[PDB]
A = this chain, B = another copy of it.
Amino acid sequence: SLAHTAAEYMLSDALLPDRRGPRLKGLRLELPLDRIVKFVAVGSPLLLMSLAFAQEFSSGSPISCFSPSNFSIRQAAYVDSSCWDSLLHHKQDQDKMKSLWPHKALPYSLLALALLMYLPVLLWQYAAVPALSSDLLFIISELDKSYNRSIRLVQHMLKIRQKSSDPYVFWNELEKARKERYFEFPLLERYLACKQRSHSLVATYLLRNSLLLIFTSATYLYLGHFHLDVFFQEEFSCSIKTGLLSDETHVPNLITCRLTSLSIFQIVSLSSVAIYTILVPVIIYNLTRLCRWDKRLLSVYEMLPAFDLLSRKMLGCPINDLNVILLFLRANISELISFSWLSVLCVLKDHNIDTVVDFMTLLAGLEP
């Protein structure tokens, strides 16, 4: 089946024969909400198209005709197959030959919608995946040096505090460490500054979401203009004597052609509206995600040395490449190593009490 081929051609990853290396393994380049939206926006028209051609209706004929008994079997087949290509209600009300082309174009329209909704996925894959992957992995490699440089070369501070009055050393020793060369990273404050003034992935993300929104609007227009007119129309009167059959002796207006699969058309015309009105607010929520700064976990991020640079750059216009980098980092920061200490520092959510809270928590997180 065509849907079987499209199941693996689209709606999945089509890069390399897989099992290559770290290009795809261990890194998530698509947000779970984006993946769900892509799946339920691409496979849904494909699912409806498959349901149109499924075992629910065992083939049969999409059109039925009431031809006179004088007609043979082949003549009846001719007058019923010549109307599936000439869907025109020759109404007696001049001669408004209203067309019923959506009935024949439904599979074409569904396939066109399925192909169209895959364009934003291709745009994201071939316009933002490489640069975003490079930035994410470089930043992850740089931030992986924030454990053997934030405690293991900082545990000498424990030696300094424990000799003197520890509460006093908690507030008047830290300026020496904050001014140390190795304590502050030398490359992140420039890379992040450069990324702050560049608008490249923000444009791609906004285009990816706006294309889906515009395609949903186009689907609404298609189903409100062409459909919803021939929606309760099941019978139409045709005319076979509209050509070389004019000089003959048989039914001029072969009345009462019937659309056998009208119910499937009606069900699809509503399931293509409900499914996408489900997705209408999800896209705008995805757009809102980038437009709002997030500071719910800034308290613990600012404490750590390397993440202090990320926390400081929290001002200005929210539309920056750094925002997309942060959005794809927080979904990827917990790959295999930050899963044991960053996820632990969640107790601090309420700098006086915070001054002494690390009296026993920070050193207790040692790997051995």
Contact = CB atoms under 8 A, between A and B. Distances in A.
A344 B191 contact: yes
Contact of A78 (B36, B64, B237): B64
Interface in A60-104: 60-61, 64-67, 69-78, 80-82, 85-86, 104
A92 to B, nearest CB: 9
B194 A82 contact: no
Interface of A: 1-2, 4-5, 7, 17-18, 20, 25, 32, 36, 50-51, 53-56, 58-61, 64-67, 69-78, 80-82, 85-86, 104, 107-108, 122, 126, 134-135, 137-138, 141, 186-187, 190-191, 194, 234-237, 243-245, 255-256, 258, 260, 262-263, 267, 334, 339-340, 343-344, 346-347, 360-361, 364-365
Contact of A262 (B80, B85, B234): B85
Given A82-B64, A244-B235, A344-B187, A53 B55 contact: yes
A138 B263 CA distance: 55
Given A73-B74, A81-B260, A256-B243, A187 B56 contact: no
Contacts of A80: 74
24 contacts: A2-B51, A2-B54, A4-B5, A53-B56, A58-B59, A64-B78, A67-B72, A67-B75, A69-B70, A69-B71, A71-B72, A73-B74, A81-B258, A82-B260, A85-B262, A85-B263, A108-B267, A135-B343, A137-B339, A141-B340, A187-B364, A234-B243, A236-B244, A244-B255
Contact of A73 (B50, B73, B365): B73
A107 B365 contact: no
A76 B72 contact: yes
Given A36-B122, A69-B75, A187-B364, 8 more contacts: A2-B50, A32-B126, A53-B56, A65-B74, A138-B344, A186-B360, A190-B347, A244-B256
A122 B35 CA distance: 13
Contact of A104 (B2, B76, B235, B263): B263
Contact of A134 (B32, B258, B343, B364): B343
Contacts of A25: 20
Given A2-B55, A76-B72, A85 B260 contact: yes
B347 A194 contact: yes
A72 B69 contact: yes
Nearest to A32: B126
Contacts of A126: 32, 36
Given A73-B74, A137-B339, A186-B360, A66 B245 contact: yes
B190 A340 contact: no
Contacts of A234: 85-86, 243
Contacts of A361: 186-187, 190
A69 B361 CA distance: 92
A334 B191 CA distance: 18
Given A18-B17, A245-B256, A78 B107 contact: no
